[PDB]
Assembly symmetry: C3
Homo-oligomer: 335 residues x 3
């Protein structure tokens, strides 16, 4: 039992990376220790300077991804610094009991707490803040991320054959509800508490003002695009703690996808577009076969291109004419 | 054939309970007789006294759950009392032909009819009212429920091993479209017919004013919370006849879930959040491992906490520190 | 390799039909040649004369369905006539690389191009136009359709047993965003370019004005209903390039359904309602057992009956009292 098991300490990393870890392991169960510190801050979320009175685990939207193996215990120290204004907690969907841990992690500014639970189920699971009476506001303002519980012998296909990834990326998709004033301009609030009432009103319309990957329009574009090479297998972890989304890799596929995010279930293959239910994290593997700049996006194209739910993946390597060839380039229609 | 088979008479019960029944059975096929009586009534749907000009099977939202086994015949007498104002009918998604039965059950006030069909497919299926030219209005006003067709040898896991539940609960989730007047207050209508035009306008926005379990905000909370004990397996039947939803048990899981609701298909395990397509009923099993008060809700948290799509499950038993332990309670951050 | 393979030329047909083809085949891989010509035109989309400044492949919403087999190459000549005003391209979700082909098929009016790709994955896949900076507008205005890549040995059930259809129908479901002027009437635009800004504004609300099958309210009703007979198996291909939908056959089922649309995955059986993710095509088989006029629709009933997402299937044959019988017709309630 957990008091007799070896402990290990994991250092988290900022999205869209994921901290180093093993897939299949010869290691036995451990109590894996993590720490997160809550940061409330105002963030610029689009290219015209709109701000969000935001709330984060570890300073980022999403929070960092935590990786353990089935049968490990997650032991998180949750810190709420006195520089914050609101109480916070955490609800791990991967956990069993006490509202996912929320009941045992209620921290006011200047407080901290330590929760342990058993990661007895494999998969990608959302975690998110959930203070009594303020749940949706904390979630939509940025307080969510992914716990990935890998099977002890790695991922498996529907026939039980081994699957793997060579790199992993974590994408959180955030439906935002930014209020507007009488002039039709987005409101800028001096404090987090001042944004509340107006935000609730926008939330109740069910219409996001912005839907962003990793905290801002274009977060995963340009110098910040995801990268890969031909022949590399990428795992794309996609979390949406509040609202449905439908990920698609343009010019690629989901080779093996667990859209409900639970690795004891067989994956589906060859997907064009998959579905992440609001309140869950899903996972797709894809092995790149062509070089070039791919778009990874929500395939409600309005939500992607107008509202912000789209990123890029820049892939190195040799073009393959067997998979795709320009036979005749654009030219005048023969008369 | 059906004319030669034994008949049986089932007495229905009000949601969220489900009438007594066997799971696996040594019984052969029967014609299972049911009766439902339509009631139009005005209902209070939230905590500030908003009303809905409602339409129900048997007086409740949802209608009662009807349970048979694969190969039985359902024989429903549908009664429309003269005290009602509108014609009604029923469309069983579990049935084959004549618009699910709608074409054969058109009853004006003061009329009744009796439909038989063969329940040749296992699963949870929506039934709902569907009068020509008035279909969405009758559905959104409350006229739906679940037919559960159990396999004759009970539920099975993906390996064909037996699954069971110890108790069953039926949850209907209702997207409501309550109109508002020039003062921004919800309108109160003296008759059902007077609510129609204004409701159609709100429906066409696709934005529910309220999204409730079992007919009202808080229906399944307080003295009306669902109950269980540690070690008990609960079946949660979830119907949504009009709009998608994404059920989640906070602090629990879907141990085995048929989110499309069709028991001949293997279930998925370990789900955090599952998806009920508008126009379907799904089913989840969960075995409680921790005591305490769980929330069962739509994980669009705005739809749950702002609009009403959330209930509670109060669970008796002994806490398990292996699954979850508070290691350090909330306390000042060490300086 | 592709340069050494036999070529074949397919003549496309207008939806809701699908061009003649084999299911299981003894044929080896071919380069299958297709041509499509883009047509921009103004279309009447409802029964009160509302117009859409539309954009189509081959003159129809959806574009025609293209059918090949796994291991074939699709070789499409894309023509953009000088009578069109906008540049166009095509993104095949069934293809690997260069944004699905979009990067290699950018055609201005008066130009054409020829793309080849390998159809290495079985399933129904969306194709759609995707010009840089104009993607959602081209999609929502009508520029999408289905590529069906059949397994070389036909469709298979979860046990690997053979499945087939006797006829196939292709349904595209289009979320439209028609602007309105100060009088609350739908705007009519003299050119395609004039509709742009106003349409973007409506798109950003995420609320369709109309949601139609095959380009108009009632497209698949009356003289244009789909047809079948008792004992015939129909394949219903359903594409939605932008927005989720939830198909349902009223009085029927999805006997075998691939709702993600990818034939290497086992289908689900007995579905009441299935789910097509925005940005995908799905496929259902159903064998008719009762005659009569069925409704095939999106089971958000507001989206179906108010906004237009519903069609009819008129089925010939003999009624079966075993599956369904009117026991007592509507009559006065006994006193
Ligand atoms: Cu918080
Ligand atoms: Cu949650
Ligand atoms: Cu009715
Ligand atoms: Cu229905
Ligand atoms: Cu175009
Ligand atoms: Cu696409
Ligand atoms: Zn690799
Ligand atoms: Zn039990
Ligand atoms: Zn046949």
């Amino acid at each position: 039992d957990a008091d007799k098991l070896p402990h290990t300490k994991v250092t988290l990393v900022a999205p869209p990376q994921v901290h180093p870890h093993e897939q299949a392991t010869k290691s036995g169960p451990k109590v894996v220790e993590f720490t997160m510190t809550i940061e409330e801050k105002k963030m610029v979320i689009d290219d015209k300077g709109t701000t969000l009175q935001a709330m984060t685990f570890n300073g980022s939207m999403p929070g960092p991804t935590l990786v353990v193996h089935e049968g490990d215990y997650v032991q998180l120290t949750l810190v709420n610094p006195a520089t914050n204004a609101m109480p916070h907690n955490v609800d791990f969907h991967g956990a069993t009991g006490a509202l996912g841990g929320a009941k045992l992690t209620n921290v006011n500014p200047g407080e901290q707490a330590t929760l342990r639970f058993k990661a007895d189920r494999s998969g990608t699971f959302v975690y998110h803040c959930a203070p009594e009476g303020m749940v949706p506001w904390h979630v939509v303002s940025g307080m969510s991320g992914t716990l990935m519980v890998l099977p002890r012998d790695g991922l498996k296909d529907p026939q039980g054959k081994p699957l793997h990834y060579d790199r992993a990326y974590t994408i959180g998709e955030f439906d935002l509800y930014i209020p507007k004033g009488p002039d039709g301009k987005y409101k800028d609030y001096a404090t987090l508490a001042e944004s509340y009432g107006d935000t609730v009103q926008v939330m109740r319309t069910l219409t996001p003002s912005h839907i962003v990957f990793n905290g801002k329009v274009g977060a995963l574009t340009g110098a910040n695009a995801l990268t890969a090479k031909v022949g590399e297998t990428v795992l794309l972890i996609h979390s949406q703690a509040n609202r449905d989304t439908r990920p698609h890799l343009i010019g690629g596929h989901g080779d093996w996808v667990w859209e409900t995010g639970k690795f004891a279930n067989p994956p589906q293959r060859d997907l064009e577009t998959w579905f992440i239910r609001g309140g869950s994290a899903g996972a797709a593997l894809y092995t790149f076969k062509q070089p070039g700049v791919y778009a990874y996006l929500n395939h409600n194209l309005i939500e992607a291109f107008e509202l912000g739910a789209a990123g890029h993946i820049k892939v190195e390597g040799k073009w393959n004419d067997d998979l795709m060839k320009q036979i005749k380039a654009p030219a005048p229609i023969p008369r």
